[PDB]
């Protein structure tokens, strides 16, 4: 009985922390600073992705609490489509922010004209469009089926259920964990080496501690992404491979591994918005 | 040559007519309260005759 209490508690605290953080980031980046830079547009769109993504947590939380989904097929379709679509937009915005910073450092002449607010708007629209392309199958595949007298809503598939199921598992594992990690690590590693080669971040104590600050921020971002996303994808893969028996420990572990990805969605505004020095200057006038 | 020109210019500035500060300040006041109704920035005009209104 206390396991349901702890799972409800972790879902609730994650949802409220994510909603508060990604609403305060939006409020700051709309009112105090604006969307006149590429990075601010990226941060605002990441905040939209994280906030709409973590607004589905009460529905999953009450679905686990009751064991029966009473909201109908339309609300389940809306909630699960918003979940998948906004997780994909958040991950794509993280990838394009890492790409943007890598281009800003390592390719400065090209970043003179590539890094404009209009191009950032086009890239964001492209991010939301590709996430629509990856999440409209979730719109047209989610349904509310009946099993064992209870009502649950998941994704239904065609006659080869195993093939489409494993195809979706593959397209989530590679296109949201493997490809983003490789992109972010390559871009940030090249950026860190280039910043170790630059003159204004070397040759003195203060320049060296500044370079160590950017290096530490890079390592923190990469480590948070890896630590938050690794257990859920590994758990999903090994549940697809071998049959984990249904027990208290595996249920609590599975829900904690689900909550870790939403914890990454909660920590994205802290790591990306609140640690910017432009945001620190905007907070310094308070 | 510059000193002679400066002396001549200062002499030409010296021999000019001066009126008292009282009468000139009174003239400034006469201009100010003679055109008070014609100043829109001084007395706020009604919005009917204001050509700067929100759309």
């Amino acid at each position: 009985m206390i396991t349901a209490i702890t799972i409800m508690a972790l879902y609730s605290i994650v949802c409220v922390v994510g909603l508060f953080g990604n609403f305060l980031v939006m409020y700051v980046i709309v009112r105090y600073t604006k969307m006149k830079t590429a990075t601010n547009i990226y941060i605002f769109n990441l905040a939209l992705a994280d906030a709409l993504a973590t607004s589905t947590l009460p529905f999953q939380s009450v679905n686990y609490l009751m064991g029966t989904w009473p909201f109908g097929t339309i609300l389940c379709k809306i909630v699960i489509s918003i979940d998948y679509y906004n997780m994909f937009t958040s991950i794509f915005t993280l990838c394009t922010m890492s790409v943007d910073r890598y281009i800003a450092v390592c390719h400065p002449v090209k970043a003179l004209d590539f890094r404009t607010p209009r191009n950032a708007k086009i890239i964001n629209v492209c991010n939301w469009i590709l996430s629509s392309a990856i999440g409209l199958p979730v719109m047209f595949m989610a349904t509310t089926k009946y099993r064992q007298g209870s009502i649950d809503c998941t994704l239904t598939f065609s006659h080869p259920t195993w093939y489409w199921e494993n195809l979706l598992k593959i397209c989530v594992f590679i296109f949201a964990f493997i490809m983003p990690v490789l992109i972010i690590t390559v871009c940030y590693g090249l950026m860190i080496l280039r910043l170790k080669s630059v003159r204004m971040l070397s040759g003195s104590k203060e320049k060296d501690r500044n370079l160590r600050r950017i290096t530490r921020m890079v390592l923190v971002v990469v480590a948070v992404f890896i630590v938050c996303w690794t257990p859920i994808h590994i758990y999903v893969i090994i549940k697809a491979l071998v049959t984990i028996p249904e027990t208290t420990f595996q249920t609590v572990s599975w829900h904690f591994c689900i909550a870790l990805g939403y914890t990454n969605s909660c920590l994205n505004p802290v790591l990306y918005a609140f640690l910017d020095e432009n945001f620190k200057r905007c907070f310094r006038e308070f | 040559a510059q000193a002679r020109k400066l002396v001549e210019q200062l002499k030409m500035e010296a021999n000019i007519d001066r009126i008292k500060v009282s009468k000139a300040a009174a003239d400034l006041m006469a201009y100010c309260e003679a055109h008070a109704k014609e100043d829109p920035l001084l007395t706020p005009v009604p919005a009917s005759e204001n050509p700067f209104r929100e759309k």
Binding site: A38, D100, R101, A104, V105, V109, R115, R199, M200, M217 | -
Partner: protein, 344 residues
């Protein structure tokens, strides 16, 4: 409720907005540079060592804007001549009277009045008396205007850059030279012609990428010509110190050039550097004196955590001058991109 006048005004302002947006997008891609220095530093030889592009003359956006200037200058020069020879036929006088009646109009001179002065060119003594008139204030390019203008008559008379530079007024003050190097565009400004007050226009830049302060190295034993008691190198040092610790230039980097590399070397192979720096005696050699001058010229930078100074030597150096400027500018661009990215 708005008719077509408001719609036309809105569309015109929309296309003005598009033009301003693309012009500001093109201009934000540029790199602005402030070339500074004392007298006879070597700035003219530094600019001459660039030699890629050193002028302007856009094809259409500025040739259209000087169309009426050519006609106005031609009419003004011919009426200046006709009022100058005064104070062999009367048909020329009638043609001149026809010119004076229509001289108040400008813009459509290329056919009718062009033919009138073309017929008026039958006189042979008019050019001799124009050459004789060297006292009246008139442009020396009057015949240089009239000769090549009437050879072509078109409604959309848009000449090349030869006629634009012909009617162009030379700038006594700011000098702009645009050159490109390795897919990046530069824009150098020489403010040496401004001798009025540096403190009243030094804020007009406020965000130049760098400053290309040039210092002649041979001036360590050359005294200033206006005082004969104080050194030229210390004047250059004072100017550099005032440029560095300016409230308007507080974070911009400085591509400092030390100009006469062989001249001061052959100078110090006879006369030591002690006369310039009485506190210094380490060597009268080239390398140690050059390093000492550079380090005594770099410590003027008070803030050594935000502003970086890049120092180079010149005087018949290869393309390493432009490469050094490019390296400094790319470092500044990396710093600005880090500041824009929220990483600095």
């Amino acid at each position: 409720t708005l008719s077509a006048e408001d719609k036309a005004a809105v569309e015109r302002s929309k296309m003005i907005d598009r033009n301003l947006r693309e012009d500001g997008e093109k201009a934000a891609r540029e790199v602005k540079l402030l070339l500074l220095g004392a007298g006879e530093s070597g700035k003219s030889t530094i600019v001459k060592q660039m030699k890629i592009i050193h002028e302007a003359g856009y094809s259409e956006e500025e040739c259209k804007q000087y169309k009426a200037v050519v006609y106005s200058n031609t009419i003004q020069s011919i009426i200046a001549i006709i009022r100058a020879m005064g104070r062999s036929a009367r048909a020329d006088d009638a043609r001149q009277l026809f010119v004076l009646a229509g001289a108040a109009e400008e813009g459509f001179m290329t056919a009718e009045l062009a033919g009138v002065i073309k017929r008026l060119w039958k006189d042979s003594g008019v050019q001799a008396c124009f050459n004789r008139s060297r006292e009246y204030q008139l442009n020396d390019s009057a015949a240089y205007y009239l000769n090549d203008l009437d050879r072509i008559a078109q409604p959309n008379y848009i000449p090349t850059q030869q006629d634009v530079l012909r009617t162009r007024v030379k700038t006594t003050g700011i000098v702009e030279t645009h050159f490109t190097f390795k897919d990046l565009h530069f824009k150098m400004f020489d403010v040496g012609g401004q001798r009025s007050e540096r403190k009243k226009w030094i804020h007009c830049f406020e965000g130049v990428t760098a400053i290309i302060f040039c210092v002649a190295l041979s001036d360590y034993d050359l005294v200033l010509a206006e005082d004969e008691e104080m050194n030229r190198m210390h004047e250059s040092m004072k100017l550099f110190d005032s440029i560095c610790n300016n409230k308007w230039f507080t974070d911009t980097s400085i591509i400092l050039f030390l100009n006469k590399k062989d001249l001061f070397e052959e100078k110090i192979k006879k006369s030591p550097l002690t006369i310039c720096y009485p506190e210094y005696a380490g060597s009268n050699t080239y390398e140690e004196a050059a390093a000492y001058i550079q380090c005594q010229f770099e410590d003027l930078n008070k803030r050594k955590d935000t502003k970086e100074i890049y120092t180079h030597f010149t005087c018949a150096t290869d393309t390493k001058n432009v490469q050094f400027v490019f390296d400094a500018v790319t470092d500044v661009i990396i710093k600005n991109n880090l500041k824009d990215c929220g990483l600095f």
